[PDB]
Amino acid sequence: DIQMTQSPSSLSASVGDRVTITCRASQSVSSAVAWYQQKPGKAPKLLIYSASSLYSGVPSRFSGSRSGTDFTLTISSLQPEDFATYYCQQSSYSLITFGQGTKVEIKEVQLVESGGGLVQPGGSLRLSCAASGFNLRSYYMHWVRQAPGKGLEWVASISPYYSYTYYADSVKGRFTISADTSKNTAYLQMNSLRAEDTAVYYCARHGYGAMDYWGQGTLVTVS
Amino acid sequence: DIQMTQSPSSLSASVGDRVTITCRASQSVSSAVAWYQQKPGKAPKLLIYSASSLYSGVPSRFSGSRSGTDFTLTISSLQPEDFATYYCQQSSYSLITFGQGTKVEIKGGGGEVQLVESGGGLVQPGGSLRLSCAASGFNLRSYYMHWVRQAPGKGLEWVASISPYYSYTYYADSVKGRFTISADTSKNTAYLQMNSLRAEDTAVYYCARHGYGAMDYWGQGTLVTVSS
Amino acid sequence: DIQMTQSPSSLSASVGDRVTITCRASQSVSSAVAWYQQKPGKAPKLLIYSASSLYSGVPSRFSGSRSGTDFTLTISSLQPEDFATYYCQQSSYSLITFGQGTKVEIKGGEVQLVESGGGLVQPGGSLRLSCAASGFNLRSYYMHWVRQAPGKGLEWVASISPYYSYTYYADSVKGRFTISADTSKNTAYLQMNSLRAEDTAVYYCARHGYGAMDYWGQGTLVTVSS
Amino acid sequence: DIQMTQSPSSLSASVGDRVTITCRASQSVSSAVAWYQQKPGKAPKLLIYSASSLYSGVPSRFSGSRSGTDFTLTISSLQPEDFATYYCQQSSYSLITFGQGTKVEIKGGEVQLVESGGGLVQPGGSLRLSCAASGFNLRSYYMHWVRQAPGKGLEWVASISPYYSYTYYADSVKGRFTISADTSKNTAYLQMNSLRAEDTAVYYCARHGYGAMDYWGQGTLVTVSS
Ligand SMILES: [Cl-]
Ligand SMILES: [Cl-]
Ligand SMILES: [Cl-]
Ligand SMILES: [Cl-]
Ligand SMILES: [Cl-]
Ligand SMILES: [Cl-]
Ligand SMILES: [Cl-]
Ligand code: NA
Ligand code: NA
């Protein structure tokens, strides 16, 4: 006797923004509505119960309202730890249902990797890393990869202005790192692809004998 | 002077949803605020002016609001032609400014038939790519699946097809020996392996489902650029 | 074993006109002919299949015919939303082919803006963009230039006032761009000097109205690179 | 010419704890050591560089140390946002390497729910899930099972009432699943019969509080596949 339709299914905002998520109750309506937050890999956490009551310990920028059939969760000033999937729940005397969930996502120096995908062993693949906010000719750039569930593994680096290259032993003679200064883009040319190459591939900018700026990564699955 | 901050920068929604987009004026405020809709490849179109006046011909499901510095565009029930990017605009007596834009994208989609291509990108001649087409709302095991491509400013060109239950493949002469079509029923996904790419392969690649001796459902397409 | 020759490749018509598009099957023939509509930036949409069957949800003003090797798509009364490109498809048991397409386009009285002059230059180069207006007296309105870098948002560039040609510029183009207008020719211009890579964008010209921009041109692409 | 060995591979701690992570350079050694934090599904963030320099905007509770070959990251007082995986990095003039990583995990308050029994079955098979409760009397609360298919949303499965053991079921599992409890042993159960591919999911146990579900277990994975 209850049904909840949640909107939007995802949204991207910036830190400090005001975000609203709606759940429309299209059958029986009551105030027995709760909101949950779920971080990737973890169980849900209760935010609000009885449609508008703040759960003990939950920060005050979360609040809930009901107007007619519409229940709304408002995050008043979005914080970096707020990025998660949010669910509404409605309860009747006989049933419980959940809305479909809303993914809330983040977003100056910027790096964007592309090129990943599901690929066949033995073939070749080019990865790209598009830089903005800086001239990557003036920086060492790095590729670092991470197989699923495993650690960071440095793959290759290329030097500023002279394009000297450095490689991990594990990819030497198979991978070539390069860059197009005119396009402010760095590249990774992967040859003779194999199962160990399955990984998220990150591009990172050198600073301080370290890597201070990272892209979000592109997934390469070899199968 | 004026400055506008638009949020969210993007949202995904479904047909029937009520969607709200905010623009905060951080300086001078008047009700001289307008909203525009822009579709890909197209000029912007005016939706609302003077913060709440609907422009002639715009559907009544679009409304504009103001509360202090906060201006809002509301779509009361999202329709399939509403997926676009939206911009607010503020005018002063000496300056014009726009918000950064909000993209409204289609969600995915439930039990509705949907095709989503991916894998496009820029490659040098001789390079290779593998396109994927992820199906939702139906099992591609039961249907012929097609790839069709369109070079910029040119016509539709059939690329390849793959049959159900038997995996028989069919290719245009222009890609024989270079492209391979396949399907993975367990992932409900079709693929186009593209080897030995040349400049003339530059195009938007669409995946399409067979129905009625025709192609009844189509993806949004993925762009492939082959350039030296 | 199939081949489709589609005619015409383009045509100009008015709302309310009857429009017909033909595809001749030059090789084997069957009833397996379909017709599609495609609008700029969108995937094709199926209109008719098996030469004459109307696809669910398509308006009845669309119909498909066949006489011999010739298949025809008829739009009994063109509506504003029908301006688009149309394609026939033919299938055999071994092949699919598409006709080359027919663009159905609009032809007075209506407000129109048409930008031109875009092109590719090196940093430090220059271009003059022009915006030809019809349907209204450009001298009576504020005219604007707005640009959009690829993948990015709209950015106001410059405005010119009616009757007095007072000019207004965004800070990013001050001292480099000049807006002007020839009212006797109903054309606005954007002289773009000292170009830099960040000026790369589609440039639109827009008419002022209601404190906003009610009519825009289709834009002209400017690319600056070394 | 460089190699880092990181320990522990994982540790469990509470908010307010002092926590230390060690990386031993077993080959050439220098001050060129950095520390990174990474949260699930996100890129690493730089914390410390040159073994002891705090990157701009990193809280002062993070500090880095060196004793000979051993490099140590210390979090003086663990905060909720610090539960993450941490990595050390060493650079030479020719190579970069990373430690194997340290997962820093929350310990468990008094309330715990622990699901077990998840596993792999063929369509038509059966499983019994267990939910062990501690820190509260299960007899006095509604208990719920809620599941989540990979990359999808929460779906309520079943609930059982306190003191009278009334049961409630989702339509999608009616006639296949049975929820039960053993109050004397503080355990709830979900018997899952006649399984199908669509039942594949992480299954959570949850305690009723305030008309909602105030405590959740970490869930147990069920995979149904031919
Ligand atoms: Cl190499
Ligand atoms: Cl490939
Ligand atoms: Cl060929
Ligand atoms: Cl003809
Ligand atoms: Cl019909
Ligand atoms: Cl009609
Ligand atoms: Cl005007
Ligand atoms: Na010139
Ligand atoms: Na059932």
Author numbering:
A (entry chain C): 1 to 107, 113 to 215, 216A, 217 to 228
B (entry chain A): 1 to 107, 109 to 215, 216A, 217 to 229
C (entry chain B): 1 to 107, 111 to 215, 216A, 217 to 229
D (entry chain D): 1 to 108, 112 to 215, 216A, 217 to 229
Question: Can I see the authors' text?
Answer:
Erythropoietin (EPO) initiates EPO receptor (EPOR) signaling in hematopoietic cells by binding to an asymmetric EPOR dimer through two different sites. Activation of erythropoiesis is dependent on an asymmetric dimer of the erythropoietin receptor (EPOR) formed by engagement of a single EPO molecule on erythroid cells. We engineered dimeric diabody‐Fc (Db‐Fc) fusion proteins that appeared to act as potent agonists of human EPOR in cell proliferation assays. Instead, a minor oligomeric form, identified as a putative tetrabody (Tb) fused to two Fc domains (Tb‐Fc2), proved to be the minimal active form.
However, VL–VH 1.1 alone crystallized readily in space group P21 and we were able to solve the structure at 2.06 Å resolution with an R free of 21.2%. The asymmetric unit contained four VL–VH chains, and superposition revealed definitive linkages between the VL and VH domains (<15 Å apart) and showed that each presents a distinct conformation owing to the flexible linker. Thus, all four sites of the Tb appear to be capable of EPOR engagement. Furthermore, each Db forms non‐covalent dimers with the other Db in the Tb (i.e., chains 2/3 and chains 1/4) through unconventional VL/VL and VH/VH interfaces. Thus, the Tb quaternary structure is dominated by the light chain self‐association that combines the two Dbs into the Tb complex. The composite interface results in a combined total buried surface area of 759 Å2, but unlike the hydrophobic VL/VH interactions, the VL/VL and VH/VH interactions are largely mediated by polar contacts. Analysis of the VL/VL interface revealed an extensive and largely symmetric hydrogen bond network between β‐strand 1b of each light chain — including residues Ser9L, Ser10L, Leu11L, and Ser12L — and further supported by hydrogen bonds and van der Waals contacts made by Ala107L and Asp17L with Ser7L (Figure 9i(i)). Thus, the formation of the Db is dictated predominantly by hydrophobic interactions nearly identical to those involved in the highly favorable association of the 4D5 Fv, and this likely represents the first step in asymmetric Tb formation.
